[PDB]
Amino acid sequence: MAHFKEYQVIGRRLPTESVPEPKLFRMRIFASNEVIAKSRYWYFLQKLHKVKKASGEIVSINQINEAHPTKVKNFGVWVRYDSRSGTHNMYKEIRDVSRVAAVETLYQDMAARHRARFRSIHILKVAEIEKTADVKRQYVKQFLTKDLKFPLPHRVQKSTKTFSYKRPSTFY
Amino acid sequence: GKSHGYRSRTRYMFQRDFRKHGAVHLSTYLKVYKVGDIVDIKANGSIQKGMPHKFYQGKTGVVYNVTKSSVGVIINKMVGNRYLEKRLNLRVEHIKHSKCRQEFLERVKANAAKRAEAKAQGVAVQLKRQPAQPRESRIVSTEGNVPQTLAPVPYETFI
Amino acid sequence: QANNFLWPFKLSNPSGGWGVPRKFKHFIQGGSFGNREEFINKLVKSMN
Amino acid sequence: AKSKNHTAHNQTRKAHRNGIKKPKTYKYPSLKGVDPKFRRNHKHALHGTAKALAAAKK
Amino acid sequence: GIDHTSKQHKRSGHRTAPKSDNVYLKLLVKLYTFLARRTDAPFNKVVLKALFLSKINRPPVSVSRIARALKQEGAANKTVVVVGTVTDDARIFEFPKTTVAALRFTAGARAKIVKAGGECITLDQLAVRAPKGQNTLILRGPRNSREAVRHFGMGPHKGKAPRILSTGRKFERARGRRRSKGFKV
RNA sequence: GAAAUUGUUGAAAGGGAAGGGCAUUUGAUCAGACA
């Protein structure tokens, strides 16, 4: 759906005389803007509670920024999604530098591997994996080995003119 | 071939309401109609004399005549691109006083009052109705009510 | 009375464009129609 | 040689050009079809009160 | 495009000149549009339009319909105005004085009016005596007395008179006009 | 003494039709306006 911000969203059903001060519920929501974010909120509250937007109210909406945006983190990611013929729960692991970055590559991944558009996905949880070795998926374990190094073979430089007088070299 | 008699297609319309068959209660006959009164029209299937045609079921018109066992109701019916005036002879069993008017009569009688209550005092009234307005600001407290965080829930089968 | 006084505003097409591939779905689905709340100001300025 | 049998297609377009004219409304509508016994009396009632006004202009 | 809410290029519907070619008519109109553009008197605006009207929309006014109007309370010294022709009426025996301004007076009409020592005035003479139509009573004649309108709205139960040439028993008086012959109207 | 249609002369174009629209190059041709 885009480049994500993450939002705390807080709502409640409207007050009534016999029930002033209804309970107040919160969701974290990944969206490109607060309009999609409040929308998503109402979308999930209605899967959980007797409410809808006409009888509820948004109390607060705030963007949550990453605590340590230049610290590499190992994310565990938990998703529900629909396929062409059923619906399915999934656990993935994503290594990045923010929840927000991490969720972008998730949708990308879900679109690429499983052909799941944004409508078909529910993020259930995004959590930082504190101890390496609770890291489960090998496509990440791979990047945790000590003194890790790797070359980038077959370098291909972008030409800026249509003709060239050399004959390139993919050295690196 | 086709069939289109008078009471055609009216099986459920003129039907009688669950556990409400039999004699009509006497209040239906004690009610009183005057020319000008506004009435709703709905057929009592157990009262074959003086029945509205089904076109007029659900319809609301004005009394123009009062007769021994009936009232004459004028309904405006639209045919082609125009309305024509229609006059109905209905027995009192197929009619009731419409409340389509009380909110008005009740509002008038009230509107006079707060106008007196103003004038006599020194005006500042404002007595047209107004649509739902949007909500004003408000401050919701957290005390006793910290926000509960919910997330979406996994797929599951039960069956 | 004030608002009716104003002839409807005739605007141009947005100068830097609509920001979306397809206009006719809701703002919330990467379209242009509906309540986009305060994001209207960016659109209308681009159009005015 | 068969042909279409029936359709309302386009009929409400036609009715809306000149428009669906609302019923049109009069102060004093006709007493058409009103109880004759009533009307007979109403006729003398009115006659009576007219007299009593032209009188009051003696 | 515009989703038009009403017909484009629509003419107002009202005459704007008369259809007539008569110089003298056109002169009166020259006079009265001036008066109408510069006096804010409503009388002049009404008179301007009436000058444009076709013959049907200006039935004759009879001199007896004039005598009636002067019988209104406080109206006897008013100068009656008729934007049309004024006709005579032997049915009134006693006709009052006054001043009538009109487009045409038939021979017998100006006679009757003049014999009572009243006065026939043309519309321009009226303009000069009453630039704002002061003290003026405009009369129009019966438009829907015409024979044509007899036949407007013909149809069952409408009571409106056949377009017919010969009349008599045996012209359009049988099946459809009486209970014993098919039905009645 | 028109047109269809034809001969000659002159000019031009022509890789499975021709003719047409918007635009300009090139050739030919020409009105106007300067004072």
Add this chain to the structure above:
RNA sequence: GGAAUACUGCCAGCUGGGACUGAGGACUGCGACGUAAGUCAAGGAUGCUGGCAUAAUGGUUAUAUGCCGCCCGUCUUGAAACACGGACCAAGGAGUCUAACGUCUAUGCGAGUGUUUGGGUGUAAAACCCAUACGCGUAAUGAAAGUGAACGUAGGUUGGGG
């Protein structure tokens, strides 16, 4: 603990490059700047300079080049149609006149109106004039014999331009 920055938004903040237009034709308005005199970008371009004065610009035409362009007429839901007519060109070639009519309009006269069967007259099919009738209208309604339009300021009520 104290800052910076990003992001979003605001300024009746300043300022550079480029393109198209220049309608109007005395003055008159709303303003701006000045202590003032005056000035101005304020109800639509002016200032300065050069070239040509002619096929230079422009029109027309033929051709070339880019892109685009299916035979018209017809009936049809749908025709470029593997539906019909049409090789070509001139010339001819189809809602008319009359009797009686409806609506609308113009004109004359108006409770009337209509001279033109006819007569008179003539510069002779014209123009000019006219007596008696007649036709339509001024009464309706009945199958008919028949009868035949004011209780009232020719009525009351509501709207009604003037």
Add this chain to the structure above:
RNA sequence: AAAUAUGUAAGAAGUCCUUGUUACUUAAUUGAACGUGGACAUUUGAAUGAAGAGCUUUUAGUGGGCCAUUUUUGGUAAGCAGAACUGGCGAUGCGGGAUGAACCGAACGUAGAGUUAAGGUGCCGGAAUACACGCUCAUCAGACACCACAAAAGGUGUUAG
């Protein structure tokens, strides 16, 4: 027992006080209907809109229709036959879908400048052989709505779960 659709009402032709007329009606000057006289003006009784509203005459063409989304009958089905509501085509060019009556965009006076729609931007062809993460290797790969088709089933190909 919905949703969509649907009747009526939201005032001066209104509301209140006084008490006249009749052959109707009441046991009854009781009522009913129509009135006289009196009291309250634009926050006078929701919103939005209103190149005004009403009304009259007369006359053309037409009376083969067809299509799309949705509802929907008959039929195995049909580019089949038949209804419902709207929107279109017919009667209509223009930009897109290469092509095409009906789809998408958008409805047309003669022109300049600008910006867009739907649809595009390797070359044809105006416009990034742009950026970014994956997936896919086909000895008949695949490539954009309407739309110019493919199914059960099966793979120790590869991917993620």
Add this chain to the structure above:
RNA sequence: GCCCUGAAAAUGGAUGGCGCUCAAGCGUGUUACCUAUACUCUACCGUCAGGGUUGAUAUGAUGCCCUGACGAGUAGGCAGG
């Protein structure tokens, strides 16, 4: 999920064609860019509407002057030529 098998028709032949394989393919995201008789501003035509203007001593009063909006079209109607 993508790919592969399952997958047979008649003139030679069609993701529109060329051709394309870390795509010029499939899913998804982000910018920029191209261009409709549409939208914005302007001129000019015409149509409709609302204003102004008889005061002579010069020339169109059906005129002149200001202002606003609008313009598709078969059958068909009317209008000005």
Add this chain to the structure above:
RNA sequence: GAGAACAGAAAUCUCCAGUAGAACAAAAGGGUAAAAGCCCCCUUGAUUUUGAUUUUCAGUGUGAAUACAAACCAUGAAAGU
């Protein structure tokens, strides 16, 4: 259902239960319980006059129907019908 000679699955007699599971010419739908069904009593309103109205509609006709007016009657203690 439970009961009574001949008498049996079915004859006729009784009590209990019974919202209609019956019946109301006829198709089917609606309606109906001190009834609209069943039994009895009195009857001719299935009559006279001429309008208005609803369905079908052109708001023509015809069929059928509704509610009044003006008669004359039927029935019932009566309201009424």
Add this chain to the structure above:
RNA sequence: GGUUGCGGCCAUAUCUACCAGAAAGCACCGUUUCCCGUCCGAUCAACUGUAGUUAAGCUGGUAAGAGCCUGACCGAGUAGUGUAGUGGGUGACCAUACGCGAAACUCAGGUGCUGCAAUCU
């Protein structure tokens, strides 16, 4: 408060099984000359209110009673549905966006209210 006569709403009033009911009322109840109706004085009619009785009618209370009535974020914002896309999918169908929104279910609470008139420890 009871009760009766006339009622309005017509089950919170109905149904099943028990029990309690003072005073008045109502009831059951005695009778067959008279009006009247029956196969039958059972019903219907009359007569007494005397001779008898709360057994029944009636009224009320009981019951993890059947029914009915009311409520709730009980189920369920579910099913269904109006509007949107050159959304997914061979298709059957299905997600999503802006709205409207049930029924069953589950649980809780209840079991006649009341008008006119007369009468009553």
